[PDB]
Amino acid sequence: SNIFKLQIDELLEQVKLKQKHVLKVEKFLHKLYDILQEIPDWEEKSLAEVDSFFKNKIVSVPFVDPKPIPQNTNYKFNYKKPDISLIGSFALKAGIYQPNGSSIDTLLTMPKELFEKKDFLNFRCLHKRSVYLAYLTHHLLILLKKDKLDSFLQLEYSYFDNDPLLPILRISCSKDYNFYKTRFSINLLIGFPYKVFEPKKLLPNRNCIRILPATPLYNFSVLSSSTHENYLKYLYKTKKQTESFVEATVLGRLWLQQRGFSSNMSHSGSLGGFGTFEFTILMAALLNGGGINSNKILLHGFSSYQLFKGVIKYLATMDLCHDGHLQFHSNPASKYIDEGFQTPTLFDKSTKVNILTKMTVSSYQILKEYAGETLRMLNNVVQDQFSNIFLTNISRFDNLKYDLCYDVQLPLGNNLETSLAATFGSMERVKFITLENFLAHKITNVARYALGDRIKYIQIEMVGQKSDFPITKRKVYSNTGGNHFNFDFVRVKLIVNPSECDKLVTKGPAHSETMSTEAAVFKNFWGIKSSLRRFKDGSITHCCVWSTSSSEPIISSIVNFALQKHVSKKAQISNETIKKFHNFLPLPNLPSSAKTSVLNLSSFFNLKKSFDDLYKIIFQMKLPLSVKSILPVGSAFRYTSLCQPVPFAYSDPDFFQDVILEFETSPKWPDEITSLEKAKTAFLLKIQEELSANSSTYRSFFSRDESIPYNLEIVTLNILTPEGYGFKFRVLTERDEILYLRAIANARNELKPELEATFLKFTAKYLASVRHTRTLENISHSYQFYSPVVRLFKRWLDTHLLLGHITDELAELIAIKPFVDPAPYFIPGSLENGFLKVLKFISQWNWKDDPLILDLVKPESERLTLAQYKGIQMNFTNLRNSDPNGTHLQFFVASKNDPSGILYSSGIPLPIATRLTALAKVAVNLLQTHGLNQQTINLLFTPGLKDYDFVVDLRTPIGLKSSCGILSAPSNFPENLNDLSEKMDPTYQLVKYLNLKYKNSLILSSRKYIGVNGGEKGDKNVITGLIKPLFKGAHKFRVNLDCNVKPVDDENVILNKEAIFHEIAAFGNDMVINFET
């Protein structure tokens, strides 16, 4: 806990505002107050007189819609000296330094004599306020010119917290009183005196706009405007009582910003409604109670950490919207009422103001989730979570923050369609003041109801909504708006539910003799799409059925139909970005492939079923030693193969799945390594013999394995199942593991590092391989989108020629990090969301100084305990002590299965490791500069190929895309199994052998999967090479060069590059075509 406290202090001091700028702004606004006193008074005026008064002036009154017309503006207007005061965070001295800048909230209380007791009706008070602001702006402008300060101030109107009913004047400074360096902007809030209007008449249930429906938003604006200093006084008391108030306030402010939470209005569509004020007020409420029994939840003696934790826990656990709400008294212990108002409510009985009116139900739910997630991070003891909680911005990219985003282009957008505008009507104008608020709810209710359980959270954002306008104009003018609507287009952002996102049928109310109300709304909502259907269990229910597709999720079809039916028939809903990602996944050549969803693993299961059939045959055969167990370890057994298994598609590199066959322990195993391996083959010979005789439908052949260095006697039995699947069997013996250790011990001290590498590859294939597939398969069921994203990630690597050096397991371990460690984000629920999160991680991963250690466990045992966590950290520090630059090892990936951390990430050349990070950084930078679209996604999956020294073009004699099981085809295995090689790509073996020969001079890369990344025919592949710095320049001639060189002087040689192409070409034979150097 001490580490957390010291980190908290370091954060506070880092963001602490410099006190010099406080004097500068205080030096100005103190003089500004004198100007406000200079402004003269004004007489009673009707709308006709004030309109003429302002007719020729540059200033324009910012009248709030509905603007006062001559008939209903019978009341008169007047101006008098206000009671100037300073409010907000600056008043409480709880502000922090913000590079984007902060704001100083100056309050001008309109004198009470300007108001009548019934001025809170029909915008009467708002229109009086508007002219009061306009008259001030007029006189403030001329006085500003008088004192020569106009040169460096810019004055414009703006809406308070994006509230259309509360325009305000914003003073900003451009490049003695010049406060540009301070990064502050003074806001002139024109509030009312306290208790001018009976607060009971302004309750949320009451109405104040005659047309009766309630007006919660309108009631809040007038009432909150009349209660500003009172809440300052309330927070002022709490600041004195508890010594840790300001420190907790900045922590919440920092926490809120990173999640993209602000105090602005949310009914418009932006995420917000909860800001520093609301967080501070809630904390103040909790310091005076908060429990159901009115007992204090927070104590004045709590520290900054404890005060923050309590507020986070209260939000996480207590529901304030549907079932329950909290009441407190500013001027009386706060009590949690179990009854709920169906909207966020933090009631203040003293002031009759609900502080959470600006928060929508949708935004509140996301708040509760974020609060809940951090509470889990805040209780975590094994891992430090300070940086995730406070020092990571998750609001930068919508796509990383939201699983799916749909942008809806509304019709006729210099005003919305008459039919669309007609839907607004007058009743909703009373309930929802602006059409933007009305449209936001309209999209929210239908989208929420339509998708139902398919989603967890929904956000409706009005893209391109402005909140500040010039003094010459009365309302904000949008280019598409024409002063009609303040937004470019609306974007629907969803957090999908992977378990039920791809359900084929949307269940509804059950059938009844008399059609229930729930049944009515379902049939009315869906119309022709609705149906009554019966299932195997015998239930009769109203349900509508959709069609799955491999290119888009079901949710894309639901939102399109629902929005068009209810919002407008001319709306255009589009999410092409998700479609591109889905298409980048290879399409298998199976029946109904296009109609299959990306979450369907039927192809993998079919391979498993064919394995289980072969599993029974092997066990029942009689051998000298009983079969202990047969463990499948192939990629397709953990749902990670890039292209799904396809029967008889034997050109695919991952066709032959590895299987570990282990016999019972015996003391007759040979004690010498080659004898042991030849003994293992003798068992595979017998399995093939009895398999060939008893089960002739199976075909089998033998192939050599050279993956383990210096163990050249490994022979694997390949079984070709009648179903069309291939399996590679290798025998594991208990004596084998100890024989390698013997070789290390008996090896000379100089050779020991080489032998331990041989052991490292053995354990990666035989011992560690079993554990990796077991955990990854079991976990993948809870993370539905893990299988598609890792496949697409392996597609991304291959296009950039990295899979040749990045082993399969290492890619999976990197690709699973966003799922097992989703903090500060959520678990991926989209193929687009998951892939980008992997790229985001690699971009910001400082593998030289930060290890990657994972808890391969299902969502909240096998969790890494503190002892195990520290031990793996110690392994990293010891390794980096000997390898500070990271030349030998770059990526440190560790977990329960691999505590060493070097098992799956050894042998990667440093050029490749930096390339992986370099590509990830450019991918993120490309996304920032240009938003996610069709063009950018194509740039992601196209390789540069220009950085490499020389580039080689190959073509296979025959296209392999069809034989790889990819739909843009063999239906049986060849009669002679030698014909299999005729339909294989050897370029993967080409680069591997050349790398060994030119390890000391060159680094060669190629595309492993030619069917997927080889054009339409899947026959084109490329070898790209790199010349190390040493041998690019000339070198003195010596025996130990180990490089192919040509003489220039008696003792100088240079890389005989022209010879090297011949050796590459001679190796390629017909396949090679062209060279670029």
Partner: peptide, 13 residues
């Protein structure tokens, strides 16, 4: 195209 000059001193980190 997605191009990054190869870094052989690990300077990109």
């Amino acid at each position: 195209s997605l191009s990054a000059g190869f870094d052989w001193t690990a300077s990109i980190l």
